[model samples]
Target chain A: MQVVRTKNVTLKPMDVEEARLQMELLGHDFFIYTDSEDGATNILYRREDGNLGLIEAKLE
Target chain B: QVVRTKNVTLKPMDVEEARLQMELLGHDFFIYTDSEDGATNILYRREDGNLGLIEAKL
Candidate 1:
């Protein structure tokens, strides 16, 4: 059986551009971060078309 | 300015169900269309051992 992995994530608050830089540095497919301007959770992912996609979370 | 460069197929689903799918796929995150709001949303794992959700808006 497969087990789920867990870790302590240090959520960093940064602008979208800065997060993009970090994602590229780590060479990860996606990066999860908080928006510095509005204090919202966001995910930035590399698109298959060579552009970045941003997904911002809000309260339900 | 940036542009929307990709066309994604967002399957409609709930957040908790999406979480399970992400785990099943062994990926850190999953993207789907919100069945409730018809918006694109992302479900991901956070470092604090909790799940995070990101809903896209136009």
Candidate 2:
């Protein structure tokens, strides 16, 4: 069986380090936020090596 | 842009298989070891709402 749940995401625009601090404080696997500098959506996740990682997405 | 660098550990897996793993994690991008050639590659979601792939070479 498969399940899907949808929720509205209100992304907060912040610097990468700010997002990293939030994720670290929350102790979660990942965090999604809007990049303040680039105005693009980004994802911050805890890598397997126990380090923080970030992804800057783009199209085209 | 100021350059920042970090290291990550990659697990050996197939591209299709890695895609499944990424979806399962509910994350935007995945880094893994290409099972065929054992090179590092990245699979991510593009802004146009399609999948994008990156193969790294040194």
Candidate 3:
């Protein structure tokens, strides 16, 4: 079940720490971007208790 | 470049039903209010051809 995107948006490079701050300031629960560590776009979000959370749990 | 946003009133529905509706719409994703969880959520089509759900908190 692959998701096909109807719209394409270019993503800008961002550091996780800086982007997380903006995510909170903007009151957005989730943020997506290319991970600086792995060059993978990842999902970052806030928890119900107002804490930072990641959508994908990295396991290696 | 323009980023467009639209407002669509979400009907109360179970996430499973939302999944069906999304398939019907044939779009990349759907944003709706979850009747089950009472949270604003997004059901997106991911690159891996699977659905990605994100629940938003205000």
Clash count per candidate: 1, 0, 4
Give model 1's clash tally.
Answer: 1
True contacts recovered per prediction: 0.02, 0.02, 0.00
Which stretch of 10 consecutive residues in model 2 chain A shows the poorest summed lDDT? Answer: A1-10
- lDDT-wise, the better of 1 and 3 is 1
Model 3, residue A22: what's the lDDT?
A: 70
Model 2 spans with C-alpha error above 4 angstroms? A4-8, B1-58
On residues B1-58, what C-alpha lDDT tens digit does candidate 2 reach at each position?
2334333456888767888999899977786656886554567665566666655433
Root-mean-square deviation per candidate: 8.2, 11.7, 14.2
Q: Model 3: residues >4 Å from true position, as ranges?
A: A1-60
In model 3, which residue pairs have backbone atoms overlapping below 3 Å?
A1-B49, A1-B50, A2-B49, A3-B49
Give candidate 1's whole-model lDDT: 0.68
Question: Candidate 3, after superposition: displacement of residue B19 in Å?
Answer: 0.6
Candidate 2, DockQ score (0 to 1)? 0.06
Interface RMSD of each: 8.4, 12.0, 14.5
Output the lDDT of residue B1, model 2.
26
Task: Assess every candidate by TM-score.
Answer: 0.53, 0.49, 0.48
Pairs of residues clashing in candidate 2: none
Q: Best candidate per TM-score, number?
A: 1
Candidate 1, superposed: residue stretches over 4 Å from native:
B1-16, B19-28, B31-58
| Native interface contact recovery, model 2 | 0.02
**What global local distance difference test value does model 3 have?**
0.58
Best by DockQ: 1
lDDT of each: 0.68, 0.64, 0.58
